[PDB]
Amino acid sequence: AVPKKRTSIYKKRIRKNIWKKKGYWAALKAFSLAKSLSTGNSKSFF
Amino acid sequence: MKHGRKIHRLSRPADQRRALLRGLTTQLLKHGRIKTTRAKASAMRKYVDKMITLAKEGSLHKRRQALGFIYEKQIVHALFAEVPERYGDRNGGYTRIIRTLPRRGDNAPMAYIELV
Amino acid sequence: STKCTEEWRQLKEAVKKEFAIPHVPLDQRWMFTLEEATGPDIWNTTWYPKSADHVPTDKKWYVVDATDLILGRMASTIAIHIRGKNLASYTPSVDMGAFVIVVNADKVAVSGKKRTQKLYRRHSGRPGGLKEETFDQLQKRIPERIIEHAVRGMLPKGRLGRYLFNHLKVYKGAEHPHQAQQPIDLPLRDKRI
Amino acid sequence: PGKCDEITTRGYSISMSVDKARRVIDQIRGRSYAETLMILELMPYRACYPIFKLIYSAAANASHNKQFNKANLIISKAEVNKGITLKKVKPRARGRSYMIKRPTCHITIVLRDITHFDSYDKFLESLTPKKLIALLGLMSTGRR
Amino acid sequence: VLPDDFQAPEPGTPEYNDIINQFLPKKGPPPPREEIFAVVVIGSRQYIVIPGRWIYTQRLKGATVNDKIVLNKVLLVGTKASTYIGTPIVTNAAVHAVVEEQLLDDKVIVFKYKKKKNYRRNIGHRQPITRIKITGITGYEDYPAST
RNA sequence: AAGGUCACGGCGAGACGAGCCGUUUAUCAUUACGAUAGGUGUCAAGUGGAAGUGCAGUGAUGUAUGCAGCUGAGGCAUCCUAACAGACCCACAGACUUGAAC
RNA sequence: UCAAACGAGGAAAGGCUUACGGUGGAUACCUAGGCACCCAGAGACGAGGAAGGGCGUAUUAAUCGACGAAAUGCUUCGGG
RNA sequence: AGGGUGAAAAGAACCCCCAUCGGGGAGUGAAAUAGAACAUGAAACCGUAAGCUCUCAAGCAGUGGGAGGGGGACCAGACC
RNA sequence: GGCCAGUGAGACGAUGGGGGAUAAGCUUCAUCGUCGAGAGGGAAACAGCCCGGAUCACCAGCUAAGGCCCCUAAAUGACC
RNA sequence: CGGUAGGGGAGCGUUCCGUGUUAGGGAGAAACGCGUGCGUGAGCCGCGUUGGACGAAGCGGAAGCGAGAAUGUCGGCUUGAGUAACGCAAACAUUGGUGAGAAUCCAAUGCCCCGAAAACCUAAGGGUUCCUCCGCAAGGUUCGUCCACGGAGGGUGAGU
RNA sequence: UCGGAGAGAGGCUCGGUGAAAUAGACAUGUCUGUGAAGAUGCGGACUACCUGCACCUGGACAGAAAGACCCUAUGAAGCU
């Protein structure tokens, strides 16, 4: 359970950039919702 | 595994879920338009369609089951004097699940219930 | 603006033609052009090949006919061409070798009792998977893995023998589908086959 | 310095973590003020709102300090750095105590108008270099 | 503080293409040295020598700067058509050369350490080398061996 | 561009990704497709006789209405509600070299 | 046009180098505060209430110093 | 445990973002990249930009040779 | 002799033996070789086995031990 | 002219001191960073759009004089990692209000929990936590417009 | 035997806050052999595109913690 050693700058920038790329994937969805929130007949967002 | 278990259970235990259903459909029948989460929205949709069509046939047995389900006294007797005059010929589909922005603090998918 | 990428690309190719020089092949070649004696001292250092020396387009192509040829000496004389140790341009760090083609893999001779006693066993990672498999079983089943197993242990199994492993083209039929560079037959120096 | 093109806006050590500010700041890089205006209206992050406050107070800065428009204005770099980290000695069981660090950011966002010349043709002229200083202000692939 | 402007001197671009196409390419001819080639033996090691080349070698025992020095220990002198295979030395041979100023080459850090047996030695070595420029090769017109 | 991804309504699929099925003048007629989910209307099905009234009884209770009443995770029908509004990725003959006939 | 050979050219996090930034307070220059000797001197004070404190005192916050219901000070004699 | 903005607070009038904190102009200053977390600011650490390069690869990450590519160049053969 | 140190746990290999079971990379001795304190080459790797004693440079040559099909330098060398 | 334990010889560097109120230095000293330079090496010399006032060499002396190790030690910052956890499984939900911003603050209605208490008062202890207004830098294991938090003011009345 | 279903709190995902033991640097395969006699790091072969997520713990002689057992100290202490 206890880690034997530490990680490099290598593997850490890989994992942190996979985390922040996983943050990248959930804003073109927000760009699509922000673009559909604009002028148009949409039956949502009262 | 959940093959074909079509009960929609929330993040609450069973009796607390029943009280959430009864209270939120009660105040849904009080105000008409209401802000819920989407799980709470569909969970209101089934039961409030059951309560619109329950007092559609305004007998005493339907009125007593309907008064037994809903909390408030003076809202069941404001219901069967309103639903045959309004929701006749609709034949199902008494609500609308207009969604909105997520909630600040949870990113909870937040919905909004009509009566149409 | 497609003309930015296209026209500036052709300007970069244009100054690639103007600044840089081609690399002449090593055939009927003297020591130096008079430009080359002004350039680097490529004489007193050991000659190292450039990219225009190991192009896979103008490599040689060899065809043996493995009918009644013994396996291991054929594998060694295929190895000595698959490295490039018959060329004076042999550097053991680049791919100076030559493509070879081995037709008739189904009729490869062996000496002694190889056919019933030599085993091509293999194993996956889990225990109890060691596959009992003898020479006649592959030669009945897939013969072009015989020679392909003989020469794979003849080449330096790093990143570079793995690259010149694909130069081997073994086919079990009597005819190979290659008409690439008109493949001249392979020269042998082995008097005992 | 780019000859008077960019607008640099710094930020206070705001009371949140640097990494989530770096995913929400690595989203909005390269996109202009309208797209970040509509995305940061609706991004589901708590780190979204001071970033949107600094973009809004950065392009309003770019329209009041300079005199630009909020449509031809792309985010240039938007770098987020570390700040001061507080130390919180929080007790935990079996007589132990853990340092819980309260992290702060340091946001510096640079904005970029397009103040262009848009020359007619490409063809090089190796004459009058004291005009070649002014005719070429921001291009690519500088030879010699 | 503004975008600067368009500048209006009303210029006309010269598209004659007889000045820029003269300016951008360069005409530089290599000097034709001659069609000759030798292999000298200096110290112990042999050098490919062609007339005009800034070679490096060993001699710093004694040799003055800018001196005119004949390297008569020649084997395998070769022209464009024929070479002269040297039974050990080609006779009456003379590679005329210019011993130039003496040099010290790059540092070769001879640092030795064994293991935990705590021993380490940083020393360095500047090899006393000499750069030689080549003038021309002569005295080689015996026993041709062209093929 | 073809084809995907998000979103959308979900699943006999599933920790999350996946996968799969929809994503509407959601047939028109002579005979297999254009019902995804919820509601509704019925049919299987579970518990099993509901309330109210009358009758018998001093009353507990039984009886007729009444296989009734609720349940309807399952089947079929029905566009009543939600499948609206969108967005994004991938484009522009696929390097270089030999042989064959056209 | 087909068949065969090769896998270039732009391709991602990242790796290296370089440049510019942020946390950080090593290095350099100090000091506002200390340490040790030498030469003298003093080791005195206190029931005429001591060393040390508590409370309080200024026109008006807190803290330190000074002061003590005569209190952010008083009398006399000298210096200025 | 926590010292050092300037020589002098001359400590930022006024405008914009704005609930503040903060930021940008302007003004003071020789210096505002000396802005109150304020004097020189190094390493670990976190970053961003530019050049080359990694997705059939086994390696105390080097070193010797060096393919290909990039940069300035002047002893253009050299250097990184 | 003067001044002045370490060391006093050794290991394996050949020979001469004792203990053992002529068992141990076992234990204790006597002469010697290596390691310890010895790099390099051969031994696939591998302190003690063979050659061999590293001042340093060379993109020099000849050899010892050992090798000359390929991985991996040199004979798919010759004759019994 | 291999070398461990070890012995001897010769040197570099650091801060201070004598020369020294030295040469030099706001025409940029020390620092910090840089090298196509020189040494056997410890190091020297030179260059810096950084920095802003000191301080060389030579000939000599004296040391709290040289760092990679001590489960050393003191500060800073990493890894694990955006992972476990967020402190009972009494349970909240909606509509309004305030605001820049509300799951969390307030108001109402239902729902739910303790009820020999999870209610009220006093002994001890604490010492201002009590109350109005203002604020959200830090604390609240989330948020916050709220607070036992920060600031200003007030508050504790006995013959029994 | 011989398990099976269901309800909660975790676990999985999202939004907030956010540690810890550990850590020479890690570009961190399997077999087999060698080696201080139990090797990802040495040798030969085979196998493996890079990199995550969720579980399991066989190894890293895993973490702890200068072995309570054994012995040594011309150690300490209690008791007889």
Curated annotation (Swiss-Prot), chain A:
The keyword Ribonucleoprotein is assigned to this record: yes
Task: Report whether Ribosomal protein shows up as a keyword of the record.
Answer: yes
Please state where this protein is localized: Plastid, Chloroplast
- Entry's Gene Ontology cellular component terms: chloroplast; large ribosomal subunit
Principal subcellular localization: plastid
GO BP terms in the entry: translation
> Taxonomically, which superkingdom?
Eukaryota
Question: What span is annotated as the signal peptide, if there is one?
Answer: none
From the record, give the transmembrane residue ranges: none
Q: Which UniProt keywords apply?
A: Chloroplast, Plastid, Ribonucleoprotein, Ribosomal protein
> A Gene Ontology molecular-function term?
structural constituent of ribosome
Instruction: Please give the family membership noted in the entry.
Output: Belongs to the bacterial ribosomal protein bL32 family.
* Oligomer status and interactors: Component of the chloroplast large ribosomal subunit (LSU). Mature 70S chloroplast ribosomes of higher plants consist of a small (30S) and a large (50S) subunit. The 30S small subunit contains 1 molecule of ribosomal RNA (16S rRNA) and 24 different proteins. The 50S large subunit contains 3 rRNA molecules (23S, 5S and 4.5S rRNA) and 33 different proteins.
The role this protein plays is: Component of the chloroplast ribosome (chloro-ribosome), a dedicated translation machinery responsible for the synthesis of chloroplast genome-encoded proteins, including proteins of the transcription and translation machinery and components of the photosynthetic apparatus.
- The name of this protein is Large ribosomal subunit protein bL32c
Native organism: Spinacia oleracea (Spinach)
Gene from which this protein is expressed: rpl32
Whole sequence portion shown: 2 to 47 of 57
From Swiss-Prot, chain C:
A Gene Ontology MF term for this entry? mRNA binding
Gene Ontology biological process: negative regulation of translation; translation
Q: Which GO terms describe its cellular component?
A: chloroplast; cytosolic large ribosomal subunit; ribosome
The alphabetical list of record keywords is:
Chloroplast, Plastid, Ribonucleoprotein, Ribosomal protein, Transit peptide
Q: Mainly localized where? A: plastid
Q: Quaternary structure per UniProt? A: Component of the chloroplast large ribosomal subunit (LSU). Mature 70S chloroplast ribosomes of higher plants consist of a small (30S) and a large (50S) subunit. The 30S small subunit contains 1 molecule of ribosomal RNA (16S rRNA) and 24 different proteins. The 50S large subunit contains 3 rRNA molecules (23S, 5S and 4.5S rRNA) and 33 different proteins.
Name the chain's protein: Large ribosomal subunit protein uL13c
State the organism named in the record.
Answer: Spinacia oleracea (Spinach)
Coverage of the whole protein, first to last residue?
Answer: 54 to 246 of 250
From Swiss-Prot, chain D:
Any one GO BP annotation for this protein: translation
Listed GO MF terms: rRNA binding; structural constituent of ribosome
Main subcellular location = plastid
GO CC, sorted alphabetically, is:
chloroplast; large ribosomal subunit
Q: Does the keyword Ribosomal protein apply?
A: yes
**Annotated localization:** Plastid, Chloroplast
List UniProt keywords, sorted A-Z: Chloroplast, Plastid, Ribonucleoprotein, Ribosomal protein, RNA-binding, rRNA-binding
Q: What does this protein do?
A: Component of the chloroplast ribosome (chloro-ribosome), a dedicated translation machinery responsible for the synthesis of chloroplast genome-encoded proteins, including proteins of the transcription and translation machinery and components of the photosynthetic apparatus.
How it assembles, according to the record, is: Component of the chloroplast large ribosomal subunit (LSU). Mature 70S chloroplast ribosomes of higher plants consist of a small (30S) and a large (50S) subunit. The 30S small subunit contains 1 molecule of ribosomal RNA (16S rRNA) and 24 different proteins. The 50S large subunit contains 3 rRNA molecules (23S, 5S and 4.5S rRNA) and 33 different proteins. uL22c binds 5S rRNA in vitro; the central segment of the protein (approximately amino acids 30 to 124) but not the last 28 amino acids are required for this binding.
* Family per record: Belongs to the universal ribosomal protein uL22 family.
This protein is called what?
Large ribosomal subunit protein uL22c
UniProtKB/Swiss-Prot annotation, chain E:
Species of provenance = Spinacia oleracea (Spinach)
Keyword Magnesium annotated: no
Q: Molecular function (GO) terms listed?
A: rRNA binding; structural constituent of ribosome
Q: Name one GO biological process term.
A: translation
Partners and quaternary state?
A: Component of the chloroplast large ribosomal subunit (LSU). Mature 70S chloroplast ribosomes of higher plants consist of a small (30S) and a large (50S) subunit. The 30S small subunit contains 1 molecule of ribosomal RNA (16S rRNA) and 24 different proteins. The 50S large subunit contains 3 rRNA molecules (23S, 5S and 4.5S rRNA) and 33 different proteins.
Q: Where in the cell is it found?
A: Plastid, Chloroplast
- Note whether Transport occurs among the keywords: no
What gene does the UniProt entry assign to this protein? RPL21
Its biological purpose: Component of the chloroplast ribosome (chloro-ribosome), a dedicated translation machinery responsible for the synthesis of chloroplast genome-encoded proteins, including proteins of the transcription and translation machinery and components of the photosynthetic apparatus.
Query: Can you list the GO cellular component terms from the UniProt entry?
Result: chloroplast; ribonucleoprotein complex; ribosome
Q: Which UniProt keywords apply?
A: Chloroplast, Plastid, Ribonucleoprotein, Ribosomal protein, RNA-binding, rRNA-binding, Transit peptide
Name of this chain's protein: Large ribosomal subunit protein bL21c
Chief location category: plastid
> Which protein family is named in the record?
Belongs to the bacterial ribosomal protein bL21 family.
